[PDB]
Amino acid sequence: PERYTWDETNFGSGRDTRDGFIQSAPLVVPPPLNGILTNANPIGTKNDIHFSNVFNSYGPLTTFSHPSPVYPQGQIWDKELDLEHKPRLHITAPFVCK
Amino acid sequence: SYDNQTHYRFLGDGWVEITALATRLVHLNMPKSENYCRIRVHNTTDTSVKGNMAKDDAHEQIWTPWSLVDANAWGVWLQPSDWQYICNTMSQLNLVSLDQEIFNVVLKTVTEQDSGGQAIKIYNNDWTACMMVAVDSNNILPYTPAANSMETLGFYPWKPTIASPYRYYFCVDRDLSVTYENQEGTIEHNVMGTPKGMNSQFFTIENTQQITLLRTGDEFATGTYYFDTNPVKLTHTWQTNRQLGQPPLLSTFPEADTDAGTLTAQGSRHGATQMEVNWVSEAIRTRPAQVGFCQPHNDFEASRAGPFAAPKVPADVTQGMDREANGSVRYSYGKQHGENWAAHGPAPERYTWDETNFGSGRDTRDGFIQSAPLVVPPPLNGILTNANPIGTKNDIHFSNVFNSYGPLTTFSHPSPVYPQGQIWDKELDLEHKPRLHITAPFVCKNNAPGQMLVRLGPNLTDQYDPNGATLSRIVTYGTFFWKGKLTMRAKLRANTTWNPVYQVSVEDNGNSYMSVTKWLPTATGNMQSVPLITRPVARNTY
Amino acid sequence: HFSNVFNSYGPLTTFSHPSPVYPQGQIWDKELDLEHKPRLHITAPFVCK
Amino acid sequence: DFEASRAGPFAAPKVPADVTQGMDREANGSVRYSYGKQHGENWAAHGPA
Amino acid sequence: SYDNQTHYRFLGDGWVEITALATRLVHLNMPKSENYCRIRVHNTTDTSVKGNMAKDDAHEQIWTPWSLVDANAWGVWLQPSDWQYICNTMSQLNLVSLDQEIFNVVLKTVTEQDSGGQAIKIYNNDWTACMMVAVDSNNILPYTPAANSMETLGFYPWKPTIASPYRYYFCVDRDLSVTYENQEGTIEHNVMGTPKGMNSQFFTIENTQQITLLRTGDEFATGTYYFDTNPVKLTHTWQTNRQLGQPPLLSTFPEADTDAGTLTAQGSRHGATQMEVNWVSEAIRTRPAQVGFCQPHNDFEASRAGPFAAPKVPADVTQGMDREANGSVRYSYGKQHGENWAAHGPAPERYTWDETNFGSGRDTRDGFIQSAPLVVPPPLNGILTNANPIGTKNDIHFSNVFNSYGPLTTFSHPSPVYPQGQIWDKELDLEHKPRLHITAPFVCKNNAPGQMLVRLGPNLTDQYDPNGATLSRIVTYGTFFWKGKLTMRAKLRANTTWNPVYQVSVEDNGNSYMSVTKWLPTATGNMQSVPLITRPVARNTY
Amino acid sequence: NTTWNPVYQVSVEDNGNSYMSVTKWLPTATGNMQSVPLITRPVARNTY
Amino acid sequence: LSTFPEADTDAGTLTAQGSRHGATQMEVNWVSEAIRTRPAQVGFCQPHN
Amino acid sequence: QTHYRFLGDGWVEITALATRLVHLNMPKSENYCRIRVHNTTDTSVKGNM
């Protein structure tokens, strides 16, 4: 079966792990070594496992764009889950019957 | 008719129609760049350093020969005293409508003559000359908050002011690698980039708005935009997950005004918790929800634009003095937007505002996390604290990477700052909006107030050739008045406590933060505008 | 371990409201006077809008 | 997750959910109640327990 | 009220009312020649050469102290982006109406004083001064397309522009003989000539139009000319005399996606041709008509006016790259009418537009002609090709003198070019009109838009004597705005194919012809206007 | 249309190695063909 | 902007980070694009795999 | 086919018309089946899960 990977075009909302870092305490101009964790520091005794693979930056100020559908193959609508508290959206399809 | 006051129209049930009247003289010069410029900016002087990268100022804005007129700052409408009256009496506020006007347009030209004597400059107006004004009512062009750089209008009535030239951002795709102190090796690649064909957007004031020419005896007036926003409380909370509901039952009563009372045996005490322990305590007892939350400290993320500090919801600084932990903000204004006038050097005055929504802030020092079936005295490896190094880094603890946000996570909206503080703000054209904005308290649910632009009419000379490189143009500059009307709705608070509540009062000439002399002119007429407390009266969350 | 500090909450994160307990269980509950309310309360199933 | 503000330390509430085969109670926010006589519990039970 | 936009009003059945709004500042100086001049021009510097004669610029125009204001150029109305939107969505376009306006007339005078210091120039307006405007609504005076020399108005809104002085032709009767390279002997007679009494026509703005004086606070407005023209398709054809109707019947079907199928024995195959051969083939089979035709290459004819290049109907360049064979056009604009601003030297930028009406073009290389009762393999003297010298000349073949035009000769109307390109054009007062014009796509069936003329009022000095040779006049110059309204009708194309069609898209910063950076300002604000594809979507002729 | 500079359009291209090759949506000598996903949101917007 | 390019090659400059107006959430006495306050958060970091 | 009906203010009523021949065979299982699926062939591996 033929395959294809669709990369969203909502630029400015994506993220590059390489450059993603985090400083510490009262911000210092040139961060020390133990005063700034980067995507090169092993977590939980694992070399390839960095903060990126476990960090969740979601929050109140976290605003984004709804995913665009794909012409062929792409799904149109989708039923909503019978859950008391619905999810902000679905990835399976762009349109969800309220 | 000039007018710069504030009228309070009282209605029934305790509702007031606050009216803001702001008039101010403006000054404008010939926009140097006769054409739109797509200038780029790269501060290699700092980005090249190993430890530096948080000082990154790389991007590529587009300069327009137009100047924006933004009055989105409380410090330009209300009067110092007025803001006081409000915060001390009101209990909530909300925007109603806006209205702007322009008039008394003066256009003069300069002629540096007297070449046979010394070097004097002669002035004289020109009627035929014309100014150009337009209003992005549909909000086509990018939004540019003047307070987003402290370039609004003067906060002092009897002192004129100038407009901040209009300039917006553009797509480029910057890139920078991570490096610390000295480290070892090179900064990999600190590339800038070129414009992409999919994200290129070059607008033009001319092909977007209906410009209007205004001569000497002309004048312009806008419509009457109606605000569709949500009101903001003018009180602060304090309660925390410890003070929520039925307090523990008392079994011991104090004998004197010194000693305290006691509770019931933790083991043999009624209640309910989420732990497997067979006892009860304030620290573990169940609560209605979560008051505030833990936010990643100094979280610098990066996209195609480059690195940036992820905004964080302002909250109480807590006893821990954790400013950069609860998102407190630090401002840098100057002269017109506050700061003393007798201050020498270009050094801009600063101030860090710590939110007063107590009970929602967090202290990292005490923040900890236990493990597995909760144990009374936690072992050593059975409890992580803000003293345990993560990812081989000593100063990097769970706090600087923990995100406690969640469903039960409820909080309070940030209160605005009197001077400098921003009023409203356009909403992002994103399918899923953010619960709020920190840039300002009020966000237009629908369309927002169209931005106002201005530009002096290009006054030409006798010698003009389009094909000719760069050619002359008679020197010119202009001034005009600006009248603004801002109506708002609010309700007076009700006195229900008993014990007098905290009021925003002033104090005799002293070292006190609230010194009258701070808002009073000097022997020469200098003065400043110090930010004022918003939400002086306590509220009650539960 | 990561479990004791990982927060998987997010946009796609959908769930079900907690069911009340017959005896003892609480019925309704006042809402916090906060500008931004919490998606729900655990103290009780019903919250007066 | 024990956080702390000006009030002091406290257990951050967590949305109740299925305990799962893992018997993870304090992981899915299950709740433990402590009633007495009037609010349930057998009447023939001795001690304030 | 200034305005320079483009509104698309959608109606029913897929028809749109496109509205063009163009406003622009203009500049005008005192017409040096206070009176009409009948100047002559003879370039003996080149006409004297043996090989030169195609550079002949001999004639005798008449200079008028008036400046024409022509906005007959798409590049001045529509915005780059807009033209795109159109070509990609529309399927045809046509002119509707025109409307013009003038206002904010500024009149200033210069006084070069400061003779006792250095040499400074002082400026100051004058109300009493007056400008003069008139409109050749009846079209008495000769027609002068400004785009017929790229002297229209600026294509950039935020950049002012000037008018091209008015000047028309006059009868003289020039003469020049034929000569090549060096040849031998003299250029016979390269005579100019004098004015004939039967073809002498000297008009005067004053005795033809009702001039109107406009001072500082005055303003003028034209009527509302309604266009009576034929719409032009916004799609290109491809089909040729080979692809017209029922394709040959297939007898063989391919086995894989590599090999092809076959037809039926040419001899034993049904159909009909105009040859006496007892077989059939695509090349000889009869067709509904003739798609395009052969045109004489570099056909220089000559009348009493002198030699000139006989215009030829633009068509597809064909694989043969035959530009000067299918009448492709080469333009030479500058700054205002396109071209990059950062280009040094007076060197004007050029561009050759190759028509996209494929199937109508011709390739000389393959063009041949057989003889008498057609023979399968043509002999040598029984078939003339584009390799046989005619009239003792090696490079001169039948192609450069063959005219394939005829009854069955059908073709497609030339598509306009976005920037530079001309819009409409007056029709020749000839009893028998030409099937079309190449200068522009739209030709007014009836009367055409009256041309607009302007002239500064002759401001005199105290010292004036009519009988006195040449006398002074206070230095003066003026500026004014010009608003234009252009409404048009068009219908949206219909998506009927299946396979996505060709769209006029842009591309990331690359070497691609469609680079975004090409229409974007520079670090200093420079930019150009590159011609754009018209008729991006394919059509279908049969 | 409010920009000025032509915006990105979903166009096709002559028979080439380009992702947007017409031959990709055209039948073969035997009638075979495919359906390649297409770009959604070719025109840029503006969030703020 | 305080510096304007001379040609279509070089770029312009800004104002001294230290002596430049604005507002950030850090305790540093300067300003820069990377630290300056923003209306909200555009996108976010998500746990990988 | 697909019809585009244009209205005022720039709004369009896009209509989608889809017709297609379908084929169906006798459902092998004359009754509802509660079949289970376990890929022990892969779940047994150490790295696989």
From Swiss-Prot, chain D:
Question: Domain text from the record?
Answer: The N-terminus of VP1 is sequestered within the mature capsid. It contains a phospholipase A2-like region and putative nuclear localization signals.
Coiled-coil intervals, chain numbering: none
Q: What does this protein do?
A: Capsid protein self-assembles to form an icosahedral capsid with a T=1 symmetry, about 22 nm in diameter, and consisting of 60 copies of two size variants of the capsid proteins, VP1 and VP2, which differ by the presence of an N-terminal extension in the minor protein VP1. The capsid encapsulates the genomic ssDNA. Capsid proteins are responsible for the attachment to host cell receptors. This attachment induces virion internalization predominantly through clathrin-dependent endocytosis.
Q: Which family does the similarity line name?
A: Belongs to the parvoviridae capsid protein family.
Q: What else is known?
A: The capsids of autonomous parvoviruses expose a proportion of VP2 N-terminus and part of that sequence can be cleaved of to form VP3.
Species annotation: Murine minute virus (strain MVMi) (MVM)
- Record's protein name: Capsid protein VP1
Q: Where in the cell is it found?
A: Virion; Host nucleus
- List the disulfide bonds in this chain: none
